[model samples]
Target: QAVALMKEHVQKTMRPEVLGGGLFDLSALGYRQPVLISGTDGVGTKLKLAFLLDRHDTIGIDCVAMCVNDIIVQGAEPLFFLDYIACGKAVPEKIAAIVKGVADGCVEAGCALIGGETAEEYDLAGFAVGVAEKERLITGETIQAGDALVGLPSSGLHSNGYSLVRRIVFEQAKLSLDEIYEPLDVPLGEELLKPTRIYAKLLRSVRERFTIKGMAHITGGGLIENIPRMLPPGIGARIQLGSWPILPIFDFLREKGSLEEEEMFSVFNMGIGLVLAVSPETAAPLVEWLSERGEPAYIIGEVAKGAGVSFAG
Candidate 1:
């Protein structure tokens, strides 16, 4: 019964539209123009914590937001989304709630929850596809020497640093999933399940207000690698550790786990979620724009002619 409805929805909405001259015209079909933004990603092992705690809801927001946030960095505003789910067991009610969370994310990002796939794989896993469009796109190749690196503060480790986090909590801290911390003052469950921030609004609002040369979403690789991915061969970055504020949670994790600072930054977001390269002339204006949008953006570093990412501790 569910499958029938899903199929009908896809055919009516997800399928490409045929238009004049036998050409597929998405715009003619009522889609956005100039550029179509698409992003695909999966919820990483962070799901393990959610599953352990029986909190299968908000992670859907993380799944959708992560992808949407990535595409918007290219100056696209999300229009709609699709999802794929594969799991060992069937939990329709729980799955529906997950979809609801996706809808909520779409609303927050000003997009629509359009289509998705749910497979009963008997082992839990899935991915999300977010589509967006805009007349402009940001290609980091525009970055040049003397451009300023604006750092957007992260909410926390986000969905990326959990491998190390699990190791520390389970092996070193000798804590189990069921253990709850109180008095120390933190919502352990909520922290672990916090949705990755959706940067779509911030990007869209500031794209025009700032001469942003290049923007990079800090993911899997961390700063040592992610920052350099946008730079040309002759250029690298110089960042100051003291320039931007680091989230206190990261400090707690590092201190407790005896993690090295460089490794931590290279592996986890540490604090910065997104990095933007802008000309020095436009740095202040961009910073102010970000501030106005309530995004924690700052002049963390500068672009230079060199080889790779470098940070002076």
Candidate 2:
């Protein structure tokens, strides 16, 4: 209630790039040859921590980031987005706040928040749909053995494998969200509930200069499971341990759960969230470009002739 009042007095404006319409022609927005990329994802169990912490604002941002990030894997420029929010009881203030978050996401991702459905169901739910250019679409099939594996760091868990996170925090560690969590410098609830990082802007510049061969958005399946999606039959990734820094939050969870290194990487991002397989020639420029854009792009490994992903320290 107070949050609503505070933000109400503040000015809220929509971005001009965001298109507005009601069931109009797709070509009106230059999507005539649209690849029709669409993605749907929820906040997941991490929302439990958000609710526990009374933070209802930014999970909507995470929801938007997750879906759009997937479509960009194919070099698609996000056109517009629609969100569905279903809550047990209608709370206008919270609903508005969430919607505002969605609007913020659309503005950041250079997409339009055309419209969506908000139903008062027995529980809370959300959905996002996005469209991108057909010609811009990219699949990882172009990846080759000499290609570089570029990894973009994540801000904590970023909406995945929370089942294990919750288990470790509540059951194993026996710590309450109310309790302070180290390395994060905030409550466990706040860190866990932090919205997923938006990558649309970062990828925008790199796509133009680099011959991006393959890309993967790490989600439910951790490194072990997700990287395979982008690798070709004879190509795989060779990830180097310690090549990139690992966030302390993941380290805490792994230590508490007594999980093995393989299990940790297999189940969670460990550190990297976005992966890019680009031609070796353009690798340095890609890394420097992402770094200049405020993203710590690490050259984690390179494509190798084998099966799935292979890792070394």
Candidate 3:
């Protein structure tokens, strides 16, 4: 309460972005498993966005998403998470909110917040440990020609490409953080600050009903680079670009940065988040199931005899 009072006074005199200055944060600011597939990743430059917006509540979700999503790619159901945090100086209120954000993610991702360490310290990261039956791991080894490529929607940008996003939105476009530009329904801050989606539940549903051949968690390299991680030798993907609608934020970035579609694809999630390689017969059914379960999905492409990924509009 006293901290809130302090912030109330401080905020009156300083821009939010100025008062929240620091590096690293929930925003892994961001988590592991079985056979336990464990993975760890930092929030990257996305933390800057959190501070820029002075929004720390959801960045922890990105931390959890980054870690858990990677382990889930190998078919592990996340079991628990360990968080790390540091601030230049600890503000009890911000730290408390940040920790709340982590627990929020742990609850949603179906994991326990087992433990963590914080220092008066760029900022937050996590380790997630998950468990999967040894025999059920979704290695790309089984992804072959004629498989269906299914895509799960991303919750916009997630935790990737913020360095470029920051440059375009602020430096070039000079957009106000609170402005609701025509194409956007909410203020720019609200849209860009949307938390990264946690896929643990989604993957759980997929596993209960199907044997996933492979999965890719689109991150820093976007679809172009990450998709190949789930493709086997002599097998590749043919992505039908327009098969799924691209989010307007993507176009906003593209136009503002004057970036090529290929460059955009190489750097950002664009729209899709998780990609699944499944048997041809299972593709349509999986898409239907995910959509039915509330995650919009698409059969955006197919695996074929070839090399990396091919995009067709």
Best by TM-score: 2
Candidate 1's residue-wise lDDT over 246-304, tens digit each?
77667766766899877888788877888889888888888876677666677888999
Q: Tens digit of lDDT per residue, candidate 3, span 215-297?
A: 99999789988999888888878999898878888888888789998889999998999998899999888778877877788
lDDT of 2 at 62: 80
Q: Which ten-residue region of model 3 has the weakest summed lDDT?
A: 23-32
Model 2, 1-313: lDDT tens digits are 7456524422232334443443434566666676677777777787777677766767777888888888787777666677777777777776776777776776678776666666862223444445666665677887888888888998888989899888888888888776676666787777787677778877877777677877888887787777878888877778888888898888778777787887788778888888988888787888887678676888888888887877886
TM-score of each: 0.83, 0.89, 0.88
Q: Please count the clashing residue pairs in each candidate, in the order shown.
A: 4, 2, 23
Candidate 2 achieves a global lDDT of 0.74
Q: Against the true structure, whose lDDT is highest?
A: 3
After superposition, the stretches of candidate 1 with alpha carbons farther than 4 Å from their true spots are 1-25, 28-35, 121-135, 176-185
In angstroms, give how far residue 97 of model 3 lies from its true place: 0.9
Residue 163 in model 2: shift from native, Å?
A: 0.7
Clashing pairs in 1: 87-122, 87-123, 88-122, 88-123
